[PDB]
Amino acid sequence: PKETTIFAMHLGKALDPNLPVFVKAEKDTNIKLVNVASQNQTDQIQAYNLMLTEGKLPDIVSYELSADLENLGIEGGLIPLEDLINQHAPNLKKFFEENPRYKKDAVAVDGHIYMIPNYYDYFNIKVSQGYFIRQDWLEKLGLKEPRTVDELYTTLKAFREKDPNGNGKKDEVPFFVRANNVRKVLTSLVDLFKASPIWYEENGMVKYGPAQKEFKHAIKELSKWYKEGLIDEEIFTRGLESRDYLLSNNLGGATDDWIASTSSYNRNLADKIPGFNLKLVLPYELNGNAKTRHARTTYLGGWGISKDAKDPVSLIKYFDYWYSVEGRRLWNFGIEGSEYTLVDGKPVFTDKVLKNPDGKTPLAVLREVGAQYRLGAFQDAQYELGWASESAKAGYKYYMDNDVVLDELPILKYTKEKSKEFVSIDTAMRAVVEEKAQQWILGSGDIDKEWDAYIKRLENLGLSKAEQIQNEAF
Ligand SMILES: CC(=O)N[C@@H]1[C@@H](O[C@@H]2OC(C(=O)O)=C[C@H](O)[C@H]2O)[C@@H](OS(=O)(=O)O)[C@@H](COS(=O)(=O)O)O[C@H]1O
Ligand SMILES: [Ca+2]
């Protein structure tokens, strides 16, 4: 065993190296992680920024924001990995040969690799969230499946007014989302209206979604729907438990959320709510547009080796372990004999994952054992196919075949100087967007009177300078 310090968090939770997956990795690698993030920290961004101030860097630095990792590397806080990989990491070396896009994702603008991304299995599943509705409530109310945003409005109003859960109470929550910050609330609300709260691509050009006319229209409509009780009153204040809470209590009528986990509730709730059918639909059309911008990026965050690590060779071998057949299987599937067994040589999940007795989704079970824990690993779509229901599996194909998903932006890279300029604009604009969007949706103020002042407000923070940086990076 080697004590190896790490800064690692994901989904609000510091890595516990005694989770089943990491106990197995420790046994296979002789690397014993010790986390410098503590079990009480939940805000990964603030924990990371604080961690940079605390003297020596941990041996391994994992982080959800890859530009900050490349900046740390340009400053000399993380070391270049590409020669270590060449000499000592045959699995990563092979992976970079077989995957040009992923290799390009790992190279900073100065030509060094400062981090190994945590890659989605992007070329096998790139769809992410999809639109779902209570087909059993549609049938109960004799309603057609809505296809346009206007039809969705009519349906959600019916869900609010007509007691589809049959209890004589006006408790229905027609539309809800699942989010742990305001940006992610907006993400699952404004895409209905073909708007975006982030930067996106239009024909090779990068634009800022909150400055676009579609966003104004999205906020105006959401304001109306919120006043009429069509949108969850508590939309900005629930955490990630919203979906479990609203579905298991038979309150939620419709959502926009990840396809496999959201599809898991039909089987999960089949006994507590007879006939529960939360069904995938294609994105609703608005003025001829049937597209969704919900898509995976090629990766999310990454991890690197700091200049303070006394044995960087043994750490790149640790990084490489996760790209071996057994390491990548462990990271994705959990523990052989517990989460899965090998059937005809390939993992098949057990009832512990597929039919959890407390009603956890399969993914929530896997996260409990330390699987899918974002670091610098390569997700295997065979794991997602392993637990996805038949209707989730058909639904990836339904979204792909109908061509409704717009590809996400590549993760953009910067020099350290351009990153510093961009974030001082981008983070300030973010705060304005989130302040005004909540204010407008919650019904204070008036977007029509206020829009032009808001746009000017973004411009005065440097909107056009950030637009220039984003287009140079793309
Ligand atoms: C790389 C990573 O961990 N991504 C998180 C998402 O995990 C995906 O979730 C699902 C699914 O829900 O069907 C399928 C993919 O295999 C997973 O990589 C997801 O995590 S979570 O388990 O739902 O919490 C999102 C959730 O955050 S959100 O509701 O705010 O989008 O977080 C991504 O980190
Ligand atoms: Ca009711």
Author numbering: 27 to 500
From the primary publication:
The solute-binding protein (Smon0123) captures GAG disaccharides in the periplasm and delivers them to the ABC transporter, followed by their import in the cytoplasm. The ABC transporter comprises membrane-spanning proteins (Smon0121-Smon0122) as heterodimers and ATPase domains (Smon0120-Smon0120) as homodimers. Similar to other solute-binding proteins, Smon0123 has two major N and C domains that are connected via a flexible hinge and that captures the substrates via a mechanism called the “Venus’s flytrap”. Because of a large molecular size (57 kDa) and EF hand-like calcium-binding site, Smon0123 should also be added to the 7th cluster.
The purified Smon0123 (N-18/C-5) was crystallized in the presence of CΔ4S6S, and the resultant crystal was suitable for determining the structure. The refined model contained four monomers in an asymmetric unit while the biological unit was monomer. In the complex crystal structure of Smon0123 with CΔ4S6S, the substrate CΔ4S6S was bound to a cleft between the N and C domains. Far from the cleft, a calcium ion was bound to the C1 subdomain. Two positively charged residues, Arg204 and Arg393, were directly bound to the sulfate group at the C-4 position. Lys210 directly formed hydrogen bonds with the sulfate group at the C-6 position. Moreover, aromatic residues such as Tyr146 and Trp284 interacted with the pyranose ring of the substrate. On the other hand, the magnitude of the hinge-bending motion of the Smon0123/CΔ4S6S structure was determined to be 39°. Therefore, two sulfate groups in CΔ4S6S shifted the arrangements of amino acid residues in the C1 subdomain, resulting in conformational changes in Smon0123/CΔ4S6S owing to the movement of the C domain. As a result, the enhancement of its ATPase activity in the presence of CΔ4S6S was lower than that of CΔ0S and CΔ4S, suggesting that CΔ4S6S-bound Smon0123 in the 39°-closed conformation is unpreferable for docking with the ABC transporter compared to that in the 47°-closed conformation.
